[PDB]
């Protein structure tokens with residue numbers, strides 16, 4: 120009558136032992152804004168509403184709407200200048216994912232971040248699903264053109280306060296982030312199905328699991344696949360699911376007597392990753408990697 | 421600073437007046453199991469767990485898993501016989517949607533139902549997105565074959581307790597419902613984006629908005645598009661959303677002082693549709709349509 124229990128206990132220690140077993144070959148990370156707050160990028164939960172007042176929008180959410188952007192792009196680009204990070208140093212948490220890549224354990228990193236820090240940390244396009252898009256590239260919005268621009272070009276336009284126009288056709292050029300009204304990227308839909316059939320461990324970091332796609336993505340994992348949340352607070356829990364599909368419905372179950380596969384480690388993402396690395400025997404490798412990669416960035420300033 | 425308010429008040433009466441205005445051209449219905457309970461099809465909230473005991477499954481949710489189906493299909497087909505409706509008479513609510521179709525107001529009916537009653541009521545494939553698939557058709561599971569079978573063929577196999585095999589290759593033939601492990605239908609992904617840009621009114625009937633895709637589909641509507649829920653109980657509400665995207669995040673807001681576009685009519689779906697029809701001047705047309713279509717079904721028994 121009972122599900123296979125791949126974790127020997129619902130703790131970080133049980134997750135580590137499972138990770139070291141033959142059974143754990145494919146890890147998927149789901150990462151959000153919480154993994155970049157220690158890099159100096161605020162998550163807007165400690166808000167945009169104040170930044171937005173000066174632009175005299177019809178309502179605050181108009182800043183996210185693709186239709187409003189196309190008629191009045193100046194507020195977005197002015198906000199983009201205000202919000203542009205002053206440096207791009209990936210965190211311990213990003214480099215933990217680089218370790219997973221280099222050890223052959225990373226099936227995919229799904230991110231809702233647009234800050235490009237995953238790429239800076241050495242994850243490649245094939246490792247990544249940027250689910251809310253990214254600033255890494257931008258495109259001309261004209262359907263017959265679609266000329267691509269790199270972040271260095273977009274940055275210069277943002278900082279010079281020149282509304283970016285396409286060099287081929289003079290249409291607007293928009294960062295490849297997902298504005299409201301736009302579909303999630305094609306990349307997301309082509310990977311999700313296949314990935315979530317093959318996943319042996321789901322690592323969820325720095326997200327409250329309230330926005331799409333992550334809010335529902337956690338439920339696509341096989342029922343036996345363990346799920347570790349590293350976050351400041353619990354996320355993804357709900358009341359016991361009362362509909363047809365029973366245990367397949369609803370979210371994380373950390374605390375009930377039916378709990379069998381989900382673990383919550385509450386604290387800083389960087390500290391959680393370092394604690395997990397330590398259990399795995401990777402703490403020196405991770406510390407060495409962070410030191411060298413941060414130094415490589417510091418050496419170019 | 422404020423959103424356009426298309427409803428003059430948050431009541432069924434305000435929705436009706438909006439529906440009669442030039443502004444309301446494209447209605448999308450999101451319908452679930454609650455619209456078919458008055459047709460004698462239980463929703464499993466007044467449960468499957470008892471039906472499942474006899475099959476001696478490894479755990480109850482194994483009945484929904486595509487991998488378990490492919491190894492051991494007999495429990496599914498035995499359950500399918502137990503659950504097979506004894507008649508197929510669409511409800512007042514289904515015929516309300518047929519009225520929307522015939523008056524040119526129906527952009528799309530998204531359904532999570534697998535019972536085929538929408539089709540019986542006269543909605544055509546182009547009107548429908550069967551988001552959890554359907555029993556209407558079945559397919560051979562072999563990738564190189566994929567032979568399609570109609571419901572009359574599947575029904576006969578279910579009732580004779582003969583495990584359905586393909587006539588071309590002898591592989592399993594599976595109803596086109598979405599088992600766990602399977603993607604939502606291609607049809608869903610090709611319509612959703614376009615539809616939810618054009619929607620003037622979202623009518624949500626007979627669903628608790630807890631499973632995907634409906635749980636998140638409500639948030640894809642334009643911020644000004646009114647949303648009417650007709651259901652036994654309130655659904656889709658959440659705590660005020662505290663993340664970046666503000667009003668774009670979280671669900672229905674029926675009851676706060678910020679409420680501006682969502683309306684909950686609590687009761688039977690059939691009674692809600694009849695009440696709305698009455699406000700619109702359609703009550704006689706709907707009653708006449710139900711009487712003739714139910715008679716046409718009764719005349720073939």
Ligand SMILES: NC(=O)c1ccc[n+]([C@@H]2O[C@H](COP(=O)([O-])OP(=O)(O)OC[C@H]3O[C@@H](n4cnc5c(N)ncnc54)[C@H](O)[C@@H]3O)[C@@H](O)[C@H]2O)c1
Pocket residue numbers: 150151152153154155156157160161162163164231232233234251325326327328329330333349350351352354386387388389663664665
């Ligand atoms: N870095 C970025 O790219 C960035 C920054 C701000 C907002 N956003 C956007 O806003 C949305 C954010 O949604 P989300 O679900 O990813 O994030 P979210 O809105 O849930 O906020 C981050 C979550 O992480 C927690 N958190 C913050 N700092 C942490 C730390 N150091 N350690 C552990 N937990 C921490 C918070 O308590 C919260 O639960 C996305 O659309 C995203 O693109 C992105």
Ligand SMILES: NC(=O)c1ccc[n+]([C@@H]2O[C@H](COP(=O)([O-])OP(=O)(O)OC[C@H]3O[C@@H](n4cnc5c(N)ncnc54)[C@H](O)[C@@H]3O)[C@@H](O)[C@H]2O)c1
Pocket residue numbers: 362363364451452453454455456457458461462463464465532533534535552626627628629630631634650651652653655687688689690
């Ligand atoms: N008819 C069917 O095809 C059928 C039947 C049972 C289950 N299911 C499947 O189970 C899942 C159901 O999810 P869902 O969100 O659509 O439904 P759900 O699980 O939310 O259950 C139906 C909802 O409608 C309400 N309800 C029931 N009868 C009602 C009536 N006469 N008037 C008003 N409200 C009523 C219930 O209180 C509940 O809120 C889907 O996967 C679906 O395919 C389908």
Ligand SMILES: Cc1cc(C)nc(SCC(=O)Nc2ncc(Cc3cccc4ccc(Br)cc34)s2)n1
Pocket residue numbers: 160161182183184195198199200202203204233234235251254255296297298299
């Ligand atoms: C490379 C780079 C550049 C910039 C401007 N920043 C960042 S990370 C910091 C940050 O919070 N910047 C942000 N820029 C815009 C933000 C808010 C916003 C507005 C309009 C459409 C949006 C569509 C999708 C998303 Br997700 C966010 C959107 S929030 N990294």
Ligand SMILES: Cc1cc(C)nc(SCC(=O)Nc2ncc(Cc3cccc4ccc(Br)cc34)s2)n1
Pocket residue numbers: 461462483484485496499500501503504505534535536552555556597598599600
């Ligand atoms: C035409 C027809 C035939 C049958 C059997 N019934 C129905 S409606 C009644 C009913 O509840 N039948 C049902 N049949 C199977 C049900 C449960 C189930 C099991 C395995 C995989 C599934 C995958 C997706 C879904 Br949604 C439900 C699934 S529930 N109409």
Ligand SMILES: [Zn+2]
Pocket residue numbers: 259260261264265266285286287288289290
């Ligand atoms: Zn161009």
Ligand SMILES: [Zn+2]
Pocket residue numbers: 560561562565566567586587588589590591
């Ligand atoms: Zn075949």
